Amino acid sequence: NITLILFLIGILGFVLNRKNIILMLISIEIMLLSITFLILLSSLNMDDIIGQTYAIYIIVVAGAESAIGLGILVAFYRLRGSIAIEY
């Protein structure tokens, strides 16, 4: 239930935000944690170590994609000098 509310918070990050692109990166991190938390709790209910394994690979991949996204942001910011959307 908490995991569902957290997914909304990550969803709501995209609704409320017109100009903060950094918040877009953070809202993906919230969504991914919410989905991993749901898998972890379900894996506990169904006594299944595969759920924990799936969550570990989501942490690995979401950590890997955070680094790519920050690198892409750095290449973007090197040329623009701002992460602000003019709106």
Partner 1 sequence: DTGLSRDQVEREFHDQVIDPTAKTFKDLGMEPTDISKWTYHYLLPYRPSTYYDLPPSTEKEMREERKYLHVLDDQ
Partner 2 sequence: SQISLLLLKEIYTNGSTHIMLDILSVLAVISGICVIISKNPIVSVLHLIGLFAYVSFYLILIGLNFVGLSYLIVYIGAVSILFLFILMLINIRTSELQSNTSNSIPLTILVGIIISSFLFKMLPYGVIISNQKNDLFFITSKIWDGALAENNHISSIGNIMYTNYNVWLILASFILLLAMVGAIVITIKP
Partner 3 sequence: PKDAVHLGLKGAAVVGGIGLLFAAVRTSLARKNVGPWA
Q: Which does 68 bind (CB under 5 to 8 A by kind): partner 1, partner 2, partner 3, none?
A: partner 2
Binding of partner 1 at residue 68 (CB under 8 A)? no
In angstroms, what CA-CA distances link 70 with 43, 63, 74, 78? 31, 11, 6, 12
**Cβ at position 69, least distance to partner 2 in Å:** 9
Place of tokens 């908490």: 2
Q: Which does 80 bind (CB under 5 to 8 A by kind): partner 1, partner 3, partner 2, none?
A: partner 1
Q: Does 84 bind partner 1 (CB under 8 A)?
A: yes
Q: Smallest distance from the beta carbon of 33 to partner 3, in angstroms?
A: 25
Task: Classify the C-alpha dihedral 23-28-32-35 as positive or negative.
Answer: positive
